[PDB]
Scaffold this active site. Structure first.
Site, short mmCIF file in Angstrom:
data_model
loop_
_atom_site.label_atom_id
_atom_site.label_comp_id
_atom_site.label_asym_id
_atom_site.label_seq_id
_atom_site.Cartn_x
_atom_site.Cartn_y
_atom_site.Cartn_z
N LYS A 158 -44.41 -1.37 -55.72
CA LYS A 158 -45.36 -0.37 -56.15
C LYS A 158 -46.73 -0.98 -56.37
O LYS A 158 -47.28 -1.77 -55.56
CB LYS A 158 -44.85 0.33 -57.43
CG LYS A 158 -43.46 0.90 -57.27
CD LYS A 158 -42.97 1.99 -58.27
CE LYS A 158 -42.33 3.14 -57.50
NZ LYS A 158 -41.06 3.68 -58.14
N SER B 6 -33.55 4.07 -59.74
CA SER B 6 -32.85 3.33 -60.79
C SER B 6 -31.65 2.44 -60.40
O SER B 6 -30.77 2.13 -61.22
CB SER B 6 -32.40 4.31 -61.89
OG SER B 6 -33.51 4.90 -62.58
N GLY C 2 -37.24 5.32 -61.44
CA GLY C 2 -37.81 4.67 -62.61
C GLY C 2 -37.29 5.26 -63.92
O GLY C 2 -37.84 4.96 -64.98
N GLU D 214 -44.07 9.51 -55.38
CA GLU D 214 -45.30 9.32 -56.15
C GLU D 214 -46.47 9.79 -55.31
O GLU D 214 -47.47 10.23 -55.87
CB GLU D 214 -45.48 7.84 -56.54
CG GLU D 214 -44.42 7.52 -57.64
CD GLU D 214 -43.92 6.09 -57.55
OE1 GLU D 214 -44.73 5.19 -57.30
OE2 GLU D 214 -42.70 5.91 -57.69
N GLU E 109 -34.21 9.60 -52.39
CA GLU E 109 -34.48 9.16 -53.74
C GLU E 109 -34.56 10.39 -54.64
O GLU E 109 -35.56 11.06 -54.61
CB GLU E 109 -35.79 8.36 -53.64
CG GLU E 109 -35.49 6.95 -53.04
CD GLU E 109 -36.64 6.00 -53.36
OE1 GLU E 109 -37.84 6.42 -53.30
OE2 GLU E 109 -36.39 4.93 -53.91
N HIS F 127 -43.33 8.58 -49.99
CA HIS F 127 -42.63 8.10 -51.18
C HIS F 127 -43.02 9.16 -52.22
O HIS F 127 -44.15 9.70 -52.26
CB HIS F 127 -43.18 6.77 -51.71
CG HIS F 127 -42.44 6.33 -52.93
ND1 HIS F 127 -42.71 6.86 -54.18
CD2 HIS F 127 -41.34 5.55 -53.07
CE1 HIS F 127 -41.84 6.37 -55.05
NE2 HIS F 127 -41.01 5.56 -54.41
N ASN G 75 -39.65 -2.46 -53.25
CA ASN G 75 -40.93 -1.72 -53.33
C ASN G 75 -41.63 -2.12 -54.62
O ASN G 75 -41.24 -1.64 -55.69
CB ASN G 75 -40.79 -0.19 -53.39
CG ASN G 75 -42.19 0.58 -53.63
OD1 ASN G 75 -43.34 0.04 -53.59
ND2 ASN G 75 -42.03 1.90 -53.91
#
Lengths: 250, 250
Positions: A13, A213, A173, A97, A167, A95, A11
Protein backbone atom coordinates in the site's frame (compact mmCIF):
# COMPACT_ATOMS: atom_id res chain seq x y z
CA UNK A 1 -6.38 -31.27 -7.37
CA UNK A 2 -4.31 -30.28 -10.44
CA UNK A 3 -4.89 -26.54 -9.75
CA UNK A 4 -2.94 -23.76 -11.35
CA UNK A 5 0.37 -22.24 -10.28
CA UNK A 6 -0.20 -20.49 -6.99
CA UNK A 7 0.32 -16.77 -6.47
CA UNK A 8 1.54 -15.12 -3.32
CA UNK A 9 1.30 -11.29 -3.71
CA UNK A 10 2.57 -8.57 -1.30
CA UNK A 11 0.70 -5.19 -1.39
CA UNK A 12 2.60 -2.63 0.67
CA UNK A 13 0.00 0.00 0.00
CA UNK A 14 1.28 3.40 0.95
CA UNK A 15 3.91 2.38 3.50
CA UNK A 16 7.71 1.85 3.66
CA UNK A 17 10.85 3.80 4.51
CA UNK A 18 14.03 3.02 2.53
CA UNK A 19 15.35 1.47 5.65
CA UNK A 20 12.51 -0.73 6.49
CA UNK A 21 12.29 -1.79 2.90
CA UNK A 22 15.94 -2.76 2.73
CA UNK A 23 15.30 -4.79 5.88
CA UNK A 24 12.28 -6.75 4.55
CA UNK A 25 13.79 -7.32 1.20
CA UNK A 26 16.81 -9.01 2.85
CA UNK A 27 14.46 -11.22 4.84
CA UNK A 28 12.68 -12.14 1.56
CA UNK A 29 15.88 -12.83 -0.32
CA UNK A 30 17.13 -15.24 2.25
CA UNK A 31 14.00 -17.33 2.15
CA UNK A 32 14.54 -20.28 0.03
CA UNK A 33 11.31 -20.90 -1.63
CA UNK A 34 11.04 -24.41 -2.60
CA UNK A 35 7.87 -25.06 -4.61
CA UNK A 36 6.36 -23.71 -7.84
CA UNK A 37 4.64 -20.35 -6.91
CA UNK A 38 5.00 -16.87 -8.19
CA UNK A 39 5.60 -14.30 -5.50
CA UNK A 40 4.75 -10.71 -6.30
CA UNK A 41 5.81 -7.51 -4.48
CA UNK A 42 3.75 -4.28 -4.94
CA UNK A 43 5.73 -1.30 -3.60
CA UNK A 44 4.82 2.38 -4.03
CA UNK A 45 6.06 4.07 -7.09
CA UNK A 46 8.96 5.88 -5.44
CA UNK A 47 10.21 2.64 -3.96
CA UNK A 48 10.06 0.56 -7.19
CA UNK A 49 13.66 1.33 -8.20
CA UNK A 50 15.03 0.47 -4.80
CA UNK A 51 13.13 -2.88 -4.91
CA UNK A 52 14.42 -3.69 -8.30
CA UNK A 53 17.98 -3.13 -7.21
CA UNK A 54 17.77 -5.26 -4.11
CA UNK A 55 15.12 -7.86 -4.64
CA UNK A 56 17.06 -10.94 -5.71
CA UNK A 57 14.82 -13.83 -4.66
CA UNK A 58 14.05 -15.47 -8.01
CA UNK A 59 10.38 -16.55 -7.48
CA UNK A 60 9.54 -12.87 -7.19
CA UNK A 61 8.27 -10.22 -9.68
CA UNK A 62 7.56 -6.54 -8.98
CA UNK A 63 4.14 -5.15 -9.77
CA UNK A 64 2.92 -1.55 -9.60
CA UNK A 65 -0.05 -0.86 -7.30
CA UNK A 66 -2.04 1.11 -9.96
CA UNK A 67 -1.41 3.15 -13.21
CA UNK A 68 -3.16 4.90 -16.04
CA UNK A 69 -3.20 3.64 -19.60
CA UNK A 70 -1.51 6.37 -21.47
CA UNK A 71 1.31 8.86 -21.01
CA UNK A 72 0.34 12.55 -21.53
CA UNK A 73 -0.96 15.51 -19.50
CA UNK A 74 -1.91 13.64 -16.34
CA UNK A 75 -0.08 15.36 -13.46
CA UNK A 76 0.70 13.11 -10.51
CA UNK A 77 -0.11 9.76 -12.21
CA UNK A 78 2.05 7.07 -13.65
CA UNK A 79 1.27 5.32 -16.89
CA UNK A 80 1.73 1.83 -18.23
CA UNK A 81 4.19 2.58 -21.12
CA UNK A 82 6.25 4.27 -18.42
CA UNK A 83 6.16 1.12 -16.38
CA UNK A 84 7.07 -1.12 -19.28
CA UNK A 85 10.15 1.04 -20.10
CA UNK A 86 11.04 0.61 -16.44
CA UNK A 87 10.76 -3.20 -16.55
CA UNK A 88 7.68 -3.40 -14.29
CA UNK A 89 5.05 -5.56 -16.06
CA UNK A 90 2.50 -6.48 -13.45
CA UNK A 91 -0.03 -4.14 -12.00
CA UNK A 92 -2.83 -4.37 -9.40
CA UNK A 93 -6.05 -2.56 -10.66
CA UNK A 94 -9.54 -1.73 -9.16
CA UNK A 95 -8.14 -2.41 -5.62
CA UNK A 96 -10.93 -1.53 -3.15
CA UNK A 97 -9.39 1.66 -1.74
CA UNK A 98 -9.22 3.04 -5.29
CA UNK A 99 -12.92 2.09 -5.99
CA UNK A 100 -13.78 3.84 -2.74
CA UNK A 101 -11.47 6.90 -2.19
CA UNK A 102 -10.27 7.97 -5.58
CA UNK A 103 -13.46 7.00 -7.34
CA UNK A 104 -12.59 4.26 -9.81
CA UNK A 105 -15.88 2.69 -11.25
CA UNK A 106 -16.45 -0.66 -12.99
CA UNK A 107 -16.17 0.60 -16.52
CA UNK A 108 -13.06 2.69 -15.51
CA UNK A 109 -11.46 -0.40 -13.89
CA UNK A 110 -12.62 -2.40 -16.87
CA UNK A 111 -10.77 0.09 -19.18
CA UNK A 112 -7.56 0.11 -17.15
CA UNK A 113 -7.69 -3.76 -17.38
CA UNK A 114 -8.21 -3.94 -21.19
CA UNK A 115 -5.38 -1.54 -21.87
CA UNK A 116 -2.89 -3.19 -19.46
CA UNK A 117 -3.85 -6.36 -21.16
CA UNK A 118 -3.21 -4.71 -24.45
CA UNK A 119 0.21 -3.52 -23.07
CA UNK A 120 1.30 -7.08 -22.31
CA UNK A 121 0.98 -6.72 -18.52
CA UNK A 122 0.06 -9.59 -16.12
CA UNK A 123 -2.85 -7.98 -14.24
CA UNK A 124 -4.38 -8.71 -10.78
CA UNK A 125 -7.80 -7.27 -10.84
CA UNK A 126 -9.67 -6.79 -7.57
CA UNK A 127 -13.42 -7.54 -7.03
CA UNK A 128 -15.47 -7.89 -3.92
CA UNK A 129 -18.60 -7.01 -1.95
CA UNK A 130 -19.11 -4.60 1.02
CA UNK A 131 -20.81 -5.71 4.27
CA UNK A 132 -24.09 -3.95 3.29
CA UNK A 133 -24.00 -6.18 0.16
CA UNK A 134 -23.15 -9.28 1.99
CA UNK A 135 -25.98 -8.60 4.36
CA UNK A 136 -28.53 -8.07 1.55
CA UNK A 137 -27.53 -11.53 0.11
CA UNK A 138 -26.15 -9.41 -2.64
CA UNK A 139 -22.58 -10.66 -2.55
CA UNK A 140 -22.97 -12.89 -5.58
CA UNK A 141 -24.52 -10.56 -8.15
CA UNK A 142 -22.11 -7.83 -7.24
CA UNK A 143 -19.05 -10.01 -7.89
CA UNK A 144 -20.58 -11.21 -11.15
CA UNK A 145 -21.34 -7.62 -12.08
CA UNK A 146 -17.75 -6.48 -11.76
CA UNK A 147 -16.27 -9.51 -13.37
CA UNK A 148 -18.68 -9.17 -16.27
CA UNK A 149 -17.74 -5.54 -16.73
CA UNK A 150 -14.11 -6.51 -17.00
CA UNK A 151 -14.89 -9.41 -19.27
CA UNK A 152 -16.80 -7.22 -21.78
CA UNK A 153 -13.59 -5.32 -22.57
CA UNK A 154 -11.30 -8.44 -22.91
CA UNK A 155 -10.58 -11.04 -25.65
CA UNK A 156 -10.70 -14.76 -25.04
CA UNK A 157 -6.98 -14.60 -25.06
CA UNK A 158 -6.49 -11.70 -22.71
CA UNK A 159 -7.46 -13.97 -19.88
CA UNK A 160 -4.02 -15.56 -19.93
CA UNK A 161 -2.68 -12.34 -18.37
CA UNK A 162 -5.58 -11.86 -15.93
CA UNK A 163 -5.70 -12.83 -12.26
CA UNK A 164 -8.64 -12.14 -9.99
CA UNK A 165 -8.35 -11.12 -6.34
CA UNK A 166 -11.62 -11.49 -4.40
CA UNK A 167 -11.28 -9.25 -1.44
CA UNK A 168 -14.50 -8.88 0.62
CA UNK A 169 -14.49 -5.16 1.51
CA UNK A 170 -15.27 -6.07 5.09
CA UNK A 171 -12.12 -8.27 5.47
CA UNK A 172 -9.59 -5.79 4.21
CA UNK A 173 -7.35 -4.51 7.05
CA UNK A 174 -10.17 -5.44 9.49
CA UNK A 175 -8.85 -8.42 11.26
CA UNK A 176 -12.05 -10.05 10.07
CA UNK A 177 -11.07 -12.80 7.60
CA UNK A 178 -13.68 -14.72 5.52
CA UNK A 179 -13.90 -18.30 6.70
CA UNK A 180 -12.41 -20.68 4.12
CA UNK A 181 -15.94 -21.77 3.45
CA UNK A 182 -17.11 -18.20 2.64
CA UNK A 183 -13.98 -17.66 0.49
CA UNK A 184 -14.45 -20.99 -1.29
CA UNK A 185 -18.04 -20.27 -2.11
CA UNK A 186 -17.18 -17.25 -4.01
CA UNK A 187 -14.29 -18.66 -5.91
CA UNK A 188 -16.36 -21.60 -7.29
CA UNK A 189 -19.21 -19.35 -8.52
CA UNK A 190 -16.67 -17.18 -10.32
CA UNK A 191 -14.82 -20.10 -11.81
CA UNK A 192 -18.22 -21.29 -12.86
CA UNK A 193 -19.00 -17.95 -14.44
CA UNK A 194 -15.69 -17.71 -16.29
CA UNK A 195 -16.16 -21.27 -17.27
CA UNK A 196 -19.53 -20.81 -18.85
CA UNK A 197 -18.73 -17.56 -20.31
CA UNK A 198 -15.27 -17.71 -21.68
CA UNK A 199 -14.31 -21.32 -21.88
CA UNK A 200 -13.88 -24.22 -19.64
CA UNK A 201 -10.23 -24.07 -20.68
CA UNK A 202 -9.83 -20.49 -19.25
CA UNK A 203 -11.56 -21.07 -15.83
CA UNK A 204 -9.11 -23.89 -15.28
CA UNK A 205 -5.89 -21.91 -15.47
CA UNK A 206 -7.33 -18.75 -13.81
CA UNK A 207 -5.62 -18.00 -10.55
CA UNK A 208 -8.24 -16.45 -8.25
CA UNK A 209 -6.79 -15.21 -5.03
CA UNK A 210 -8.33 -14.35 -1.67
CA UNK A 211 -7.24 -11.22 0.21
CA UNK A 212 -8.60 -9.46 3.30
CA UNK A 213 -6.90 -9.94 6.73
CA UNK A 214 -5.05 -13.08 5.56
CA UNK A 215 -2.17 -14.07 7.87
CA UNK A 216 0.43 -16.89 8.35
CA UNK A 217 -1.88 -18.76 10.71
CA UNK A 218 -4.95 -18.81 8.34
CA UNK A 219 -3.35 -18.89 4.91
CA UNK A 220 -3.00 -22.70 5.23
CA UNK A 221 -6.55 -23.43 5.97
CA UNK A 222 -7.48 -20.88 3.25
CA UNK A 223 -5.27 -22.66 0.68
CA UNK A 224 -6.62 -26.02 1.23
CA UNK A 225 -9.90 -25.03 -0.56
CA UNK A 226 -10.01 -26.28 -4.19
CA UNK A 227 -10.78 -22.97 -5.92
CA UNK A 228 -8.46 -20.79 -3.81
CA UNK A 229 -5.15 -20.14 -5.71
CA UNK A 230 -3.34 -17.86 -3.39
CA UNK A 231 -3.48 -14.54 -1.81
CA UNK A 232 -3.31 -10.85 -2.04
CA UNK A 233 -1.79 -9.70 1.29
CA UNK A 234 -1.68 -6.26 2.78
CA UNK A 235 -0.81 -5.82 6.38
CA UNK A 236 0.94 -9.21 6.83
CA UNK A 237 3.09 -8.48 3.93
CA UNK A 238 5.00 -5.80 5.86
CA UNK A 239 6.37 -8.61 7.99
CA UNK A 240 8.68 -11.60 8.01
CA UNK A 241 5.72 -13.85 8.45
CA UNK A 242 5.07 -13.28 4.71
CA UNK A 243 7.51 -16.19 4.39
CA UNK A 244 5.12 -18.45 6.04
CA UNK A 245 2.32 -17.19 3.83
CA UNK A 246 4.18 -18.07 0.65
CA UNK A 247 4.97 -21.60 2.10
CA UNK A 248 1.22 -22.23 2.68
CA UNK A 249 0.65 -22.51 -1.01
CA UNK A 250 2.68 -25.66 -0.80
CA UNK B 1 12.01 46.24 -8.69
CA UNK B 2 13.48 44.41 -5.67
CA UNK B 3 11.26 41.32 -6.33
CA UNK B 4 11.79 37.96 -4.75
CA UNK B 5 14.04 35.12 -5.87
CA UNK B 6 12.68 33.83 -9.15
CA UNK B 7 11.46 30.28 -9.66
CA UNK B 8 11.75 28.27 -12.82
CA UNK B 9 9.82 24.95 -12.42
CA UNK B 10 9.69 21.96 -14.84
CA UNK B 11 6.50 19.78 -14.69
CA UNK B 12 7.00 16.65 -16.77
CA UNK B 13 3.51 15.47 -16.05
CA UNK B 14 3.11 11.86 -17.01
CA UNK B 15 5.87 11.60 -19.61
CA UNK B 16 9.49 10.37 -19.84
CA UNK B 17 11.41 7.21 -20.75
CA UNK B 18 14.63 6.47 -18.83
CA UNK B 19 16.45 7.28 -21.98
CA UNK B 20 14.88 10.53 -22.77
CA UNK B 21 15.23 11.56 -19.19
CA UNK B 22 18.93 10.78 -19.09
CA UNK B 23 19.22 12.90 -22.24
CA UNK B 24 17.42 16.00 -20.86
CA UNK B 25 19.09 15.82 -17.55
CA UNK B 26 22.52 15.97 -19.26
CA UNK B 27 21.37 19.02 -21.21
CA UNK B 28 20.26 20.62 -17.90
CA UNK B 29 23.46 19.79 -16.09
CA UNK B 30 25.61 21.39 -18.69
CA UNK B 31 23.76 24.67 -18.55
CA UNK B 32 25.61 27.05 -16.45
CA UNK B 33 23.04 29.05 -14.72
CA UNK B 34 24.39 32.29 -13.77
CA UNK B 35 21.89 34.29 -11.70
CA UNK B 36 20.00 33.75 -8.43
CA UNK B 37 16.93 31.53 -9.32
CA UNK B 38 15.71 28.25 -8.02
CA UNK B 39 15.04 25.69 -10.72
CA UNK B 40 12.69 22.87 -9.88
CA UNK B 41 12.16 19.55 -11.71
CA UNK B 42 8.88 17.59 -11.19
CA UNK B 43 9.28 14.03 -12.56
CA UNK B 44 6.83 11.15 -12.10
CA UNK B 45 7.23 9.08 -9.05
CA UNK B 46 8.97 6.16 -10.75
CA UNK B 47 11.52 8.50 -12.27
CA UNK B 48 12.38 10.41 -9.04
CA UNK B 49 15.27 8.11 -8.10
CA UNK B 50 16.82 8.26 -11.53
CA UNK B 51 16.62 12.11 -11.40
CA UNK B 52 18.20 12.24 -8.03
CA UNK B 53 21.11 10.15 -9.19
CA UNK B 54 21.83 12.16 -12.30
CA UNK B 55 20.63 15.68 -11.73
CA UNK B 56 23.77 17.54 -10.72
CA UNK B 57 23.05 21.14 -11.73
CA UNK B 58 23.17 22.93 -8.37
CA UNK B 59 20.36 25.55 -8.84
CA UNK B 60 17.95 22.65 -9.10
CA UNK B 61 15.67 20.83 -6.57
CA UNK B 62 13.38 17.87 -7.24
CA UNK B 63 9.71 18.16 -6.38
CA UNK B 64 7.00 15.49 -6.51
CA UNK B 65 3.99 16.23 -8.75
CA UNK B 66 1.38 15.35 -6.04
CA UNK B 67 1.09 13.23 -2.80
CA UNK B 68 -1.20 12.44 0.07
CA UNK B 69 -0.61 13.56 3.63
CA UNK B 70 -0.29 10.36 5.47
CA UNK B 71 1.10 6.87 4.98
CA UNK B 72 -1.42 4.01 5.53
CA UNK B 73 -3.94 1.96 3.54
CA UNK B 74 -4.01 4.07 0.39
CA UNK B 75 -3.21 1.73 -2.52
CA UNK B 76 -1.56 3.39 -5.49
CA UNK B 77 -0.75 6.74 -3.79
CA UNK B 78 2.42 8.17 -2.41
CA UNK B 79 2.58 10.07 0.84
CA UNK B 80 4.58 12.97 2.16
CA UNK B 81 6.49 11.19 5.00
CA UNK B 82 7.52 8.76 2.27
CA UNK B 83 8.82 11.63 0.22
CA UNK B 84 10.70 13.21 3.09
CA UNK B 85 12.50 9.88 3.86
CA UNK B 86 13.41 9.89 0.18
CA UNK B 87 14.87 13.41 0.28
CA UNK B 88 12.17 14.99 -1.92
CA UNK B 89 10.83 18.09 -0.11
CA UNK B 90 8.91 20.08 -2.67
CA UNK B 91 5.58 19.12 -4.07
CA UNK B 92 3.12 20.60 -6.61
CA UNK B 93 -0.54 20.42 -5.28
CA UNK B 94 -4.06 21.26 -6.72
CA UNK B 95 -2.57 21.26 -10.28
CA UNK B 96 -5.50 21.73 -12.69
CA UNK B 97 -5.58 18.20 -14.12
CA UNK B 98 -5.99 16.88 -10.57
CA UNK B 99 -8.85 19.39 -9.80
CA UNK B 100 -10.47 18.22 -13.02
CA UNK B 101 -9.79 14.45 -13.60
CA UNK B 102 -9.14 12.94 -10.23
CA UNK B 103 -11.51 15.23 -8.41
CA UNK B 104 -9.46 17.28 -5.98
CA UNK B 105 -11.67 20.15 -4.49
CA UNK B 106 -10.64 23.39 -2.75
CA UNK B 107 -10.88 22.12 0.79
CA UNK B 108 -9.06 18.87 -0.28
CA UNK B 109 -6.28 20.92 -1.94
CA UNK B 110 -6.36 23.20 1.05
CA UNK B 111 -5.78 20.14 3.34
CA UNK B 112 -2.96 18.69 1.25
CA UNK B 113 -1.34 22.20 1.46
CA UNK B 114 -1.64 22.58 5.28
CA UNK B 115 -0.19 19.17 5.92
CA UNK B 116 2.73 19.53 3.45
CA UNK B 117 3.34 22.78 5.15
CA UNK B 118 3.23 21.00 8.44
CA UNK B 119 5.72 18.41 7.00
CA UNK B 120 8.29 21.11 6.20
CA UNK B 121 7.76 20.95 2.43
CA UNK B 122 8.18 23.94 0.03
CA UNK B 123 4.83 23.82 -1.79
CA UNK B 124 3.72 25.16 -5.22
CA UNK B 125 0.02 25.42 -5.09
CA UNK B 126 -1.93 25.84 -8.32
CA UNK B 127 -4.95 28.20 -8.80
CA UNK B 128 -6.68 29.46 -11.87
CA UNK B 129 -9.92 30.08 -13.77
CA UNK B 130 -11.51 28.17 -16.72
CA UNK B 131 -12.59 29.94 -19.94
CA UNK B 132 -16.29 29.84 -18.89
CA UNK B 133 -15.15 31.78 -15.77
CA UNK B 134 -13.04 34.17 -17.64
CA UNK B 135 -15.91 34.85 -19.94
CA UNK B 136 -18.37 35.51 -17.09
CA UNK B 137 -15.89 38.14 -15.68
CA UNK B 138 -15.56 35.61 -12.95
CA UNK B 139 -11.81 35.13 -13.11
CA UNK B 140 -11.10 37.28 -10.08
CA UNK B 141 -13.49 35.89 -7.48
CA UNK B 142 -12.58 32.37 -8.42
CA UNK B 143 -8.85 32.93 -7.84
CA UNK B 144 -9.61 34.68 -4.55
CA UNK B 145 -11.89 31.81 -3.59
CA UNK B 146 -9.21 29.18 -3.98
CA UNK B 147 -6.48 31.22 -2.41
CA UNK B 148 -8.74 31.98 0.54
CA UNK B 149 -9.52 28.32 1.00
CA UNK B 150 -5.83 27.55 1.19
CA UNK B 151 -5.19 30.48 3.47
CA UNK B 152 -7.83 29.37 6.02
CA UNK B 153 -5.80 26.23 6.75
CA UNK B 154 -2.35 27.99 7.03
CA UNK B 155 -0.49 29.97 9.76
CA UNK B 156 1.07 33.35 9.13
CA UNK B 157 4.32 31.54 9.08
CA UNK B 158 3.41 28.73 6.73
CA UNK B 159 3.51 31.21 3.91
CA UNK B 160 7.30 31.08 3.89
CA UNK B 161 7.02 27.62 2.31
CA UNK B 162 4.17 28.49 -0.07
CA UNK B 163 4.42 29.43 -3.74
CA UNK B 164 1.44 30.16 -5.95
CA UNK B 165 1.17 29.12 -9.59
CA UNK B 166 -1.61 30.94 -11.48
CA UNK B 167 -2.37 28.80 -14.43
CA UNK B 168 -5.46 29.92 -16.43
CA UNK B 169 -7.14 26.60 -17.30
CA UNK B 170 -7.49 27.77 -20.87
CA UNK B 171 -3.70 28.33 -21.32
CA UNK B 172 -2.53 24.97 -20.09
CA UNK B 173 -1.16 22.83 -22.98
CA UNK B 174 -3.31 24.94 -25.37
CA UNK B 175 -0.83 27.02 -27.18
CA UNK B 176 -2.93 29.91 -25.93
CA UNK B 177 -0.76 31.91 -23.49
CA UNK B 178 -2.19 34.79 -21.36
CA UNK B 179 -0.81 38.09 -22.56
CA UNK B 180 1.64 39.54 -20.02
CA UNK B 181 -1.01 42.10 -19.29
CA UNK B 182 -3.64 39.43 -18.44
CA UNK B 183 -1.04 37.53 -16.35
CA UNK B 184 0.06 40.71 -14.57
CA UNK B 185 -3.45 41.67 -13.68
CA UNK B 186 -4.00 38.58 -11.78
CA UNK B 187 -0.75 38.54 -9.95
CA UNK B 188 -1.25 42.09 -8.54
CA UNK B 189 -4.79 41.35 -7.24
CA UNK B 190 -3.46 38.26 -5.49
CA UNK B 191 -0.46 40.03 -4.05
CA UNK B 192 -2.95 42.62 -2.94
CA UNK B 193 -5.12 39.98 -1.33
CA UNK B 194 -2.23 38.27 0.47
CA UNK B 195 -1.03 41.65 1.43
CA UNK B 196 -4.21 42.75 3.08
CA UNK B 197 -4.93 39.48 4.54
CA UNK B 198 -1.75 38.06 5.84
CA UNK B 199 0.73 40.84 6.00
CA UNK B 200 2.38 43.25 3.74
CA UNK B 201 5.59 41.47 4.71
CA UNK B 202 4.31 38.10 3.30
CA UNK B 203 2.96 39.42 -0.09
CA UNK B 204 6.41 40.83 -0.70
CA UNK B 205 8.39 37.61 -0.57
CA UNK B 206 5.66 35.45 -2.18
CA UNK B 207 6.78 34.03 -5.47
CA UNK B 208 3.70 33.83 -7.72
CA UNK B 209 4.38 32.09 -10.95
CA UNK B 210 2.55 32.03 -14.28
CA UNK B 211 2.08 28.74 -16.16
CA UNK B 212 0.02 27.81 -19.23
CA UNK B 213 1.69 27.48 -22.69
CA UNK B 214 4.78 29.45 -21.57
CA UNK B 215 7.75 29.04 -23.93
CA UNK B 216 11.33 30.40 -24.48
CA UNK B 217 10.06 33.12 -26.81
CA UNK B 218 7.39 34.53 -24.37
CA UNK B 219 8.92 33.87 -20.97
CA UNK B 220 10.93 37.12 -21.32
CA UNK B 221 8.07 39.37 -21.99
CA UNK B 222 6.15 37.50 -19.25
CA UNK B 223 8.97 38.08 -16.72
CA UNK B 224 9.27 41.70 -17.27
CA UNK B 225 5.93 42.27 -15.41
CA UNK B 226 6.47 43.42 -11.79
CA UNK B 227 4.32 40.81 -10.02
CA UNK B 228 5.38 37.82 -12.17
CA UNK B 229 8.07 35.75 -10.33
CA UNK B 230 8.62 32.91 -12.67
CA UNK B 231 6.97 30.01 -14.24
CA UNK B 232 5.48 26.64 -13.99
CA UNK B 233 6.25 24.95 -17.35
CA UNK B 234 4.77 21.83 -18.82
CA UNK B 235 5.28 21.06 -22.44
CA UNK B 236 8.36 23.31 -22.93
CA UNK B 237 10.01 21.67 -20.07
CA UNK B 238 10.47 18.43 -22.03
CA UNK B 239 12.91 20.34 -24.20
CA UNK B 240 16.32 21.96 -24.27
CA UNK B 241 14.68 25.31 -24.66
CA UNK B 242 13.92 25.07 -20.91
CA UNK B 243 17.41 26.57 -20.65
CA UNK B 244 16.26 29.68 -22.26
CA UNK B 245 13.24 29.80 -19.99
CA UNK B 246 15.36 29.73 -16.85
CA UNK B 247 17.62 32.54 -18.34
CA UNK B 248 14.54 34.79 -18.85
CA UNK B 249 14.23 35.28 -15.15
CA UNK B 250 17.45 37.19 -15.42
Amino acid sequence: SAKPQPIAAANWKCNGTTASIEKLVQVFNEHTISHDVQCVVAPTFVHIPLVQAKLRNPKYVISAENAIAKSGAFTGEVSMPILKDIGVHWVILGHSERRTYYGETDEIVAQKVSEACKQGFMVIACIGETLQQREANQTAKVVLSQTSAIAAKLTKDAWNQVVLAYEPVWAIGTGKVATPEQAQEVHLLLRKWVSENIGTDVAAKLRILYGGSVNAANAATLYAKPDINGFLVGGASLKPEFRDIIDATR
